[PDB]
Swiss-Prot record, chain B:
Species annotation: Saccharomyces cerevisiae (strain ATCC 204508 / S288c) (Baker's yeast)
Modified residues (Phosphoserine): S43
Family of the protein in this entry: Belongs to the NKP1 family.
Protein name per Swiss-Prot or TrEMBL: Inner kinetochore subunit NKP1
Cellular location(s): Nucleus; Chromosome, Centromere, Kinetochore
Superkingdom, natural source: Eukaryota
Known function: Component of the kinetochore, a multiprotein complex that assembles on centromeric DNA and attaches chromosomes to spindle microtubules, mediating chromosome segregation and sister chromatid segregation during meiosis and mitosis. Component of the inner kinetochore constitutive centromere-associated network (CCAN), which serves as a structural platform for outer kinetochore assembly.
Record's subunit section: Component of the inner kinetochore constitutive centromere-associated network (CCAN) (also known as central kinetochore CTF19 complex in yeast), which is composed of at least AME1, CHL4, CNN1, CTF3, CTF19, IML3, MCM16, MCM21, MCM22, MHF1, MHF2, MIF2, NKP1, NKP2, OKP1 and WIP1. NKP1 interacts directly with OKP1 and AME1.
UniProtKB/Swiss-Prot annotation, chain D:
Subunit structure and binding partners: Component of the heterotetrameric kinetochore subcomplex COMA, which consists of AME1, CTF19, MCM21 and OKP1. The COMA subcomplex is part of a larger constitutive centromere-associated network (CCAN) (also known as central kinetochore CTF19 complex in yeast), which is composed of at least AME1, CHL4, CNN1, CTF3, CTF19, IML3, MCM16, MCM21, MCM22, MHF1, MHF2, MIF2, NKP1, NKP2, OKP1 and WIP1. COMA binds the centromeric nucleosome-binding protein MIF2, and to the outer kinetochore MIND subcomplex. CTF19 interacts with the CTF3 complex subunits CTF3, MCM16 and MCM22 as well as CHL4 and IML3.
One GO CC annotation: nucleus
Protein name in the entry: Inner kinetochore subunit CTF19
Function field: Component of the kinetochore, a multiprotein complex that assembles on centromeric DNA and attaches chromosomes to spindle microtubules, mediating chromosome segregation and sister chromatid segregation during meiosis and mitosis. Component of the inner kinetochore COMA complex, which connects centromere-associated proteins and the outer kinetochore. COMA interacts with other inner kinetochore proteins to form the inner kinetochore constitutive centromere-associated network (CCAN), which serves as a structural platform for outer kinetochore assembly.
Chief location category: nucleus
Compartment(s) of residence: Nucleus; Chromosome, Centromere, Kinetochore
UniProt entry tagged with the keyword Coiled coil: yes
UniProtKB/Swiss-Prot annotation, chain E:
Other observations noted: Present with 606 molecules/cell in log phase SD medium.
Protein family membership: Belongs to the CENP-N/CHL4 family.
Function: Component of the kinetochore, a multiprotein complex that assembles on centromeric DNA and attaches chromosomes to spindle microtubules, mediating chromosome segregation and sister chromatid segregation during meiosis and mitosis. Component of the inner kinetochore constitutive centromere-associated network (CCAN), which serves as a structural platform for outer kinetochore assembly.
Gene it is expressed from: CHL4
Superkingdom in the source lineage: Eukaryota
Name the record gives this protein: Inner kinetochore subunit CHL4
Intracellular or extracellular location(s): Nucleus; Chromosome, Centromere, Kinetochore
Cysteine disulfide partners in this protein: none
Oligomeric form and interacting partners: Forms a heterodimer with IML3. CHL4-IML3 is part of a larger constitutive centromere-associated network (CCAN) (also known as central kinetochore CTF19 complex in yeast), which is composed of at least AME1, CHL4, CNN1, CTF3, CTF19, IML3, MCM16, MCM21, MCM22, MHF1, MHF2, MIF2, NKP1, NKP2, OKP1 and WIP1. Interacts with CTF3 and CTF19.
Transmembrane regions: none
From Swiss-Prot, chain F:
Binding partners and assembly: Component of the heterotrimeric kinetochore subcomplex CTF3, which consists of CTF3, MCM16 and MCM22. The CTF3 subcomplex is part of a larger constitutive centromere-associated network (CCAN) (also known as central kinetochore CTF19 complex in yeast), which is composed of at least AME1, CHL4, CNN1, CTF3, CTF19, IML3, MCM16, MCM21, MCM22, MHF1, MHF2, MIF2, NKP1, NKP2, OKP1 and WIP1. Interacts with CTF19.
Organism in which the protein naturally occurs: Saccharomyces cerevisiae (strain ATCC 204508 / S288c) (Baker's yeast)
Protein name per UniProt: Inner kinetochore subunit MCM16
Family to which the UniProt record says this protein belongs: Belongs to the CENP-H/MCM16 family.
Recorded name of the encoding gene: MCM16
Function: Component of the kinetochore, a multiprotein complex that assembles on centromeric DNA and attaches chromosomes to spindle microtubules, mediating chromosome segregation and sister chromatid segregation during meiosis and mitosis. Component of the inner kinetochore constitutive centromere-associated network (CCAN), which serves as a structural platform for outer kinetochore assembly.
Complete-protein stretch covered: 5 to 61 of 181
Additional remark text: Present with 279 molecules/cell in log phase SD medium.
């Protein structure tokens, strides 16, 4: 008992005294809590910048023991939203490194698929190289445009299948090649970015005529959202 | 915009008496400003009106 | 699963408690170093250790 | 030794103990790159955060104010219903619109989407 | 150059785990890489004493980047001073490193 | 379910020997307080105290 006085069992007596020896205070956690919710609201836009550091270029001056970053790194996070699913897709990351000779950002690593040429978009920048953060925003904004656009043509075709207007279909990653299967007739479409440019009807019926084929293809032409409106009118003529 | 703000789904009388609403509002605003000027110089009120007009010009 | 897991948390629960006890005890032998003018001392009295053996 | 790094931590400690390529866990620094650089002259305020325990549905309301023009700033208030369990979300409505932008903002309501309305308004 | 707690030893193995594969768990024994590489040729150029100094590294094997992983596990080579190209970046891309950057060699 | 198995036997390891120097070092405090000068003691007294530890274990 004599040693028990000199030692301090206070952390055992009160559970609140046990915590920081074991570590986040309730006030700090609550003060931190609103930050995470704030960050998620900020990510609603879809284009964000996040800090990064290369583990290999870190060096120490040894004068005071501090650590300085040799080459600065800037990361771009791209997120897109889907209407039908109402969920965020897998984010795409683009990472930039700074040259040590002429302090200009250059593309280091990117997770953008091959059919989107992010390297070509980078070279379109006026000086051929990014200097400030605003200049990088234009590059990030445009890559987000195609990512939305390529995804945009996908859910609209899937919407038609969900409505049971047409039958089963298969489409590629870019959604350029779409197999328009609705009834005994088979149609193939060459769709441009967010615009329908070409369509091709393949099946031929005995009652079906070549003159009918020419005008049906022209009627099917138009905008992608207007395809559904023209879809009911054109097919109703077949069975009327 | 006008059709949702009309609440009666026809705007012919609105276009008809738009001008009348204007003139009546203007000349009652005349007596309002006359009473305010008679009461006081209203430097703060004049500044507020000028700022409101500037905001109207901006948007 | 959790019954083993909750047991695991009670490993370090006293361990963290008593490492603090150990560091307090280790620090406690360090005020006694400066309290004593000389580190070397005469042999402990026989009756003193008898009470130490008495202490459970 | 070993080090357990929290979200709130010293910058020098984070740099010393990092040996992998990942976003920095220091969050006060993270918001600096995101608010001061990515979206300048933008103010975001969260009014409240309340939970529905029966269904686990999160209700959130946020106000956006644009400081692009100090003489003519317009504020937009959004209300959204988080699923809080999956990546889905239930509904979204606009509580109020500033009178100087209600005409132009009306056309955005035709799009009926989250990213399209927010990104265009900032642009 | 001058060269134990089993809690520190497991961190040492995990540090090499992250560097060569990118994740602590790993994505697909455990030493194999995601994609094996048969031959790589790296040329390193640097400027010392106002002149160009170059060294050529040639490799051969079944999984060169996988094989380099265990050499760090055996403490033969230092994991801290591992260049990005040697770590496994640019898999199956034989190129020349110039002033800290990797250039495709054709 | 085997992962936590090998985890606890080492937890059984670093819990028992450090339990022992907590016994012996704290015994020094109750020796050293009544006699500040005397930190040394004969061999018998040191391992007669160890016999007390043996029975307690």
């Amino acid at each position: 008992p004599g040693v028990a006085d000199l030692l301090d069992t206070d952390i055992l007596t009160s559970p609140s005294k046990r915590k920081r020896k074991l570590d986040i205070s309730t006030s700090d956690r609550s003060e931190l809590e609103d930050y995470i919710v704030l960050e998620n609201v900020y990510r609603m836009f879809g284009i964000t910048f996040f800090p990064l550091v290369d583990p290999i270029d870190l060096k120490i001056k040894d004068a005071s023991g501090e650590i300085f970053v040799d080459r600065e790194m800037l990361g771009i996070r791209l997120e897109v939203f889907s209407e039908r699913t109402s969920q965020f897709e897998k984010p795409h990351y683009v990472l930039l490194k700074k040259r040590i000779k002429s302090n200009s950002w250059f593309l280091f690593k990117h997770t953008i698929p091959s059919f989107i040429d992010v390297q070509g978009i980078f070279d379109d920048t006026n000086g051929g190289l990014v200097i400030s953060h605003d200049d990088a925003y234009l590059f990030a904004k445009r890559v987000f445009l195609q990512l939305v656009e390529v995804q945009k043509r996908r859910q609209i075709f899937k919407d038609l299948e969900a409505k049971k207007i047409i039958h089963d279909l298969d489409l590629d990653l870019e959604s350029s090649m779409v197999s328009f299967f609705v009834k005994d007739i088979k149609v193939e479409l060459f769709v441009k970015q967010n615009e329908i440019v070409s369509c091709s009807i393949l099946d031929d019926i005995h009652d079906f005529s070549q003159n009918n084929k020419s005008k049906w293809e022209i009627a099917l032409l138009g905008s992608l959202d207007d395809l559904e409106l023209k879809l009911n009118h054109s097919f109703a003529t077949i069975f009327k | 915009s006008i059709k949702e703000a009309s609440e009666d789904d026809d705007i012919s009388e609105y276009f008809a008496t738009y001008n009348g609403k204007l003139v009546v509002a203007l000349e009652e605003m005349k007596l309002l400003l006359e009473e305010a000027v008679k009461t006081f110089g209203n430097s703060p009120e004049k500044r507020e009106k000028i700022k409101k007009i500037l905001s109207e010009l901006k948007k | 699963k959790d019954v083993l897991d909750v047991y695991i948390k009670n490993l370090e629960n006293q361990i963290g408690n008593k490492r603090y006890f150990l560091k307090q005890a280790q620090g406690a032998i360090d005020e006694i170093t400066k309290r004593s003018l000389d580190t070397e001392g005469k042999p402990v009295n026989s009756e003193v250790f008898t009470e130490l053996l008495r202490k459970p | 030794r070993v080090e357990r790094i929290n979200g709130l931590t010293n910058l020098q400690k984070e740099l010393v103990t990092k040996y992998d390529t990942l976003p920095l866990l220091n969050m006060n620094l993270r918001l600096s790159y995101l608010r001061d650089h990515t979206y300048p002259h933008l103010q975001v305020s969260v009014q409240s955060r309340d939970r529905v325990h029966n269904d686990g549905i999160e209700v959130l309301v946020v106000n956006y104010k644009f400081c692009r023009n100090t003489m003519n700033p317009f504020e937009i208030q959004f209300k959204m219903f988080y699923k809080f369990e999956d990546s889905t979300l239930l509904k979204w409505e606009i509580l109020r619109i500033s009178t100087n932008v209600r005409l132009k903002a009306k056309q955005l309501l035709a799009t009926r989407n989250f990213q399209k309305c927010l990104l265009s308004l900032y642009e | 150059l001058n060269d134990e707690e089993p809690e520190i030893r497991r961190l040492r193995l995990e540090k090499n785990m992250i560097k060569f594969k990118g994740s602590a768990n790993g994505v697909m024994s455990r030493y194999s890489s995601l994609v094996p590489i048969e031959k790589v040729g790296f040329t390193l150029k640097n400027e010392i004493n106002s002149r160009i100094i170059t060294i050529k590294l040639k490799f051969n094997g079944n999984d060169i980047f996988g094989g380099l992983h265990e050499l760090c596990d055996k403490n033969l080579i230092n994991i801290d001073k591992v260049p990005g190209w040697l770590a496994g970046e640019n898999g199956s891309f034989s190129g020349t490193i110039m002033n800290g950057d990797f250039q495709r060699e054709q | 379910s085997e992962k936590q198995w090998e985890r606890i036997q080492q937890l059984e390891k670093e819990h028992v020997e450090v339990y022992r120097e907590l016994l012996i070092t704290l015994d020094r405090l109750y020796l050293i307080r009544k006699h500040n000068h005397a930190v040394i003691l004969s061999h018998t007294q040191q391992r007669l105290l160890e016999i007390r530890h043996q029975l307690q274990i």
